[PDB]
Design a protein around this ligand. Structure first.
Ligand SMILES: [Mg+2]
Ligand SMILES: [Mg+2]
Ligand SMILES: [Mg+2]
Ligand SMILES: [Mg+2]
Ligand SMILES: [Mg+2]
Ligand SMILES: [Mg+2]
Ligand SMILES: [Mg+2]
Ligand SMILES: [Mg+2]
Ligand SMILES: [Mg+2]
Lengths: 60, 25, 144, 95, 182, 220
RNA sequence: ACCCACUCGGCACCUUACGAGAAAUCAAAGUCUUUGGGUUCUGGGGGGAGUAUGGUCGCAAGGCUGAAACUUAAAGGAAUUG
RNA sequence: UUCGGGUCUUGUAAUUGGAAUGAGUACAAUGUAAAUACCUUAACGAGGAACAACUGGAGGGCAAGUCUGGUGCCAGCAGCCG
């Protein structure tokens, strides 16, 4: 109908969201290695010189 | 409202409170 | 030239003029009158514990339509009663009635924040445990 | 012609006794509950209601004093409710 | 009640923490010299700011003033001894002209890299951190060891290190033992 | 690219003929510049930066007719600045006309020394100030290598100027970018408007370039 | 009593910005980031509120002095186009 | 001549090798009034080097998404605008 349940119930969206498990990953290096990775990714491996840097460019 | 009439209403409230106090002074 | 005197022997009136004008501020007046200790729910206190009396929700303003889940808490330090906000999504059920809850400031200098009317305090801890640890299931309520 | 929506797991019907201001209403819920009803979303200024109107309202389990009105029936789906009889029939509400 | 010894802060975070150009410059300097955090750049900028404050205060004072002479040449000799200020410009007005990269350059990290015994800046960082480089038969496990001019000629791998000549180490010794056994 | 630039002004004609060699001749005799190509000819390396794009609306009977105000700053980082402010329908056209005005309004600045003089000037010569709207900008000389202590827009203006070290202080509603940049422009162009002891001796009033070279103008 | 010229003082007025302002405008609202002639009073966002209380004056009306709790993201000034 | 060797370098790949090292344990000795602990150092101690770095945020202010799914003025977010 208009509303699928009791409207004012607390923790509604949290309760009914689909629990999607964390995706397992390779370890992300931390510390000086992370700064080196960022430096390589931004100032020696310039990817999209057009426009801005556009870090995290949405895929479309 | 105008400031004039707000002032006058305040004066009338003071009227009532003053007569009440005078009756009980 | 200007309103203030300028002579070399006018320190007295300059000082007293500044001292009389300082009361025009709000921070200085609050600090010197010490209204925080006498009138505010906490006397110069960042946090304070209290007991949950009942479990209320309060509607928002015009531009924002919702009901923010609050809680009425009587402070233990002095006995005052204040409404407080249970911050996150599914935290209303976490805090049960008549349990000790540590209220904190709401971040807007003791004034209502956002669209929630007549509230000035968050909720940080309940029954000794923090709400943020409960909300991510890092800890659980002791249920005593 | 639209299908009439029944209550489910907490929502219940009621009748407006007197409508207050600032989007507030006094509603008699048919459990002997002279409750306060709050005009709510999808209901602010899209559908209008008045005194003595059949109403559907969701409760709040953390406070039973106030309750949030959700859907209004147009005096004909009210008749359908009346024949199927989920609400008490000891009340006459006609035109 | 014992007399305290004074701890003191050695850095100062910038007031605008979110400047795009400044963030990019900080990342450039971090990647160029293998700095672990951006607190390193803050520390060098704080040292430079103290140096500049002293230099400007001495500049305000009149020329040929005992304070100016004494502490100005003291700061000059200290900076040339560090090596950041070239001998050409011992004037106390080129002191105001130093850049943060100048002090960055004198780190034991970059000096080990320059000497070539470490072929990469991060290689220099790890080699320093593994207790290998010794500045005058004294190892330094600290990348920010400001190498002074009088002692730069004495950087080399330590004797205790395998590179300077000693037992190889855990992995090589274990492999040799395994080969000898089988 | 394609550029003919038939000169319509006598100054433009002289520049095209190659008779004016330095922009200092233009600034000295207070000549009026109306062709942006003159400034392009004299300063080949005028970089720019679009400071702000602002949507400005006019309420008509049908909807709200919206244009865009571009605030462009042009300069060469060697003591030459210009501040163009333009309004146009399309943003790209707004920026083009804004840089165009900015090139038209180039101005020289007088960089000086904070203390003793050792190398090239690093800061301004004296304290200067300007005021546009309610925004008053005060530029104050700073010791060598002190950076540009200024808000990002004013900082970019000084960087385009070539001033490497300077202190600033702004009073008013410095929020509005056009007012702040115009006030800073007034101050930095006023730097050459302050008589200083090292600028006291009189000169010989060298004849105007369009007087000595009037023949090469007046297209016949 | 007029006419012409000048001067002192007064209510004023026209033009203008070469000065000042957020502007409307001001010959002072100028000589203010190039900030200091002397001096008195007043204001520190809006509301609550010129309310309560306490003094004091008054026959009375009311005058003078005069907050806070709390609430609020604006209230307001000048001007532009509709 | 399309090439194209990559002639010269710089990254990306659960490919693949050899090194170095502590954080930990621990003979000792130093340390200490006696002991910890630190400095030194035997013998062990890295492959997913699982010896696994979090805390906040991704509309603006303010660096970083108009990607996917969920909820649809609810739940909630939001210091302010939203
Ligand atoms: Mg309402
Ligand atoms: Mg006020
Ligand atoms: Mg008032
Ligand atoms: Mg009284
Ligand atoms: Mg108005
Ligand atoms: Mg995270
Ligand atoms: Mg978030
Ligand atoms: Mg997200
Ligand atoms: Mg951004």
């Amino acid at each position: 109908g208009k509303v699928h349940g009791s409207l004012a119930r607390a923790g509604k969206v949290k309760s009914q969201t689909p629990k999607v498990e964390k995706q397992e990953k390779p370890k992300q290096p931390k510390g000086r290695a992370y700064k080196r990775l960022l430096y390589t990714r931004r100032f020696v491996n310039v990817t999209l010189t057009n426009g801005k840097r556009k870090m995290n460019p949405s895929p479309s | 409202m105008r400031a004039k009439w707000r002032k006058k209403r305040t004066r009338r409230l003071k009227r009532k409170r003053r007569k009440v106090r005078a009756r009980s002074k | 030239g200007k309103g203030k005197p300028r002579g070399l022997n006018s320190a007295r009136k300059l000082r007293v003029h500044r001292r009389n004008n300082r009361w025009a501020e709000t921070t200085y007046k609050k600090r010197l009158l010490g209204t925080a200790f006498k009138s505010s729910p906490f006397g110069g206190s960042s946090h304070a514990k209290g007991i949950v009396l009942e479990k209320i929700g309060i509607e928002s303003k015009q531009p924002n339509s919702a009901i923010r889940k609050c809680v009425r808490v009587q402070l233990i330090k002095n006995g005052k009663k204040v409404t407080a906000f249970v911050p996150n999504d599914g935290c209303l059920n976490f805090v049960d009635e008549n349990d000790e809850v540590l209220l904190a400031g709401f971040g807007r200098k003791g004034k209502a924040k956002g669209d929630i009317p007549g509230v000035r305090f968050k909720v940080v801890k309940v029954s000794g445990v923090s709400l943020l640890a409960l909300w991510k299931e890092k800890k659980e309520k002791p249920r005593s | 012609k639209r299908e009439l929506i029944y209550k489910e797991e907490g929502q219940e019907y009621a009748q407006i006794t007197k409508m207050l201001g600032n989007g507030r209403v006094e509603a008699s819920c048919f459990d002997g509950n002279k409750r306060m009803a709050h005009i709510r979303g999808k209901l602010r200024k899209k559908v209008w209601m008045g005194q003595g109107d059949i109403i559907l309202v969701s409760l709040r389990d953390f406070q039973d004093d106030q309750c949030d009105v959700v859907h209004k029936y147009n005096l004909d789906e009210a008749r359908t409710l009346k024949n199927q009889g989920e609400l008490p029939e000891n009340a006459k509400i006609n035109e | 009640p014992r007399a305290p010894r004074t701890y003191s802060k050695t850095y100062s975070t910038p007031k605008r923490p979110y400047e795009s150009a400044r963030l990019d410059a900080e990342l450039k300097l971090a990647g160029e010299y293998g700095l672990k955090n951006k607190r390193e750049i803050y520390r060098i900028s704080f040292q430079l700011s103290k140096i500049r404050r002293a230099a400007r205060d001495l500049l305000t004072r009149d020329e040929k003033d005992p304070k100016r002479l004494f502490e100005g040449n003291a700061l000059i000799r200290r900076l040339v001894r560090i090596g950041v200020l070239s001998e050409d410009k011992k004037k106390l007005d080129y002191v105001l002209a130093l850049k943060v990269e100048d002090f960055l350059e004198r780190r034991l990290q970059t000096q080990v890299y320059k000497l070539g015994l470490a072929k990469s800046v991060h290689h220099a960082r790890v080699l320093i951190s593994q207790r290998h480089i010794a500045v005058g038969k004294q190892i330094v496990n600290i990348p920010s060891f400001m190498v002074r001019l009088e002692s730069e000629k004495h950087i080399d791998f330590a004797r205790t290190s395998p590179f300077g000549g000693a037992r190889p180490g855990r992995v090589a010794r274990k492999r040799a033992a395994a080969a000898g056994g089988e | 690219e394609e550029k003919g630039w038939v000169p319509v002004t006598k100054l433009g004609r002289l520049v095209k003929a190659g008779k004016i060699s330095s922009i200092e001749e233009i600034f000295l005799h207070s000549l009026p510049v109306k062709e942006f190509q003159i400034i392009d000819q004299l300063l080949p390396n005028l970089k720019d930066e679009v400071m702000n794009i602002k949507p400005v609306q006019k309420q008509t009977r049908a909807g709200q007719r919206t244009r865009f105000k571009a605030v462009v700053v042009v300069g060469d980082s060697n003591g030459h600045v210009g501040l163009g402010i333009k309004t146009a329908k399309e943003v790209a056209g707004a920026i083009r006309a804004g840089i165009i005005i900015a090139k038209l309004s180039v101005i020289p600045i007088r960089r000086g020394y904070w203390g003793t003089n050792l190398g090239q000037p690093h800061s301004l010569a004296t304290k200067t100030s300007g005021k546009c709207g309610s925004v008053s900008v005060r530029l104050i000389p700073a010791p060598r290598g002190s950076g540009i202590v200024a808000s990002p827009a004013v900082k970019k203006l000084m960087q385009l100027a070539g001033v490497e070290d300077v202190y600033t202080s702004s009073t008013g509603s410095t929020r509005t970018l056009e007012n702040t940049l115009k006030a800073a422009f007034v101050a930095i162009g006023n730097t050459y408007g302050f008589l200083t002891p090292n600028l006291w001796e009189v000169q010989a009033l060298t004849p105007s370039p369009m007087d000595v070279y009037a023949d090469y103008a007046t297209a016949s």
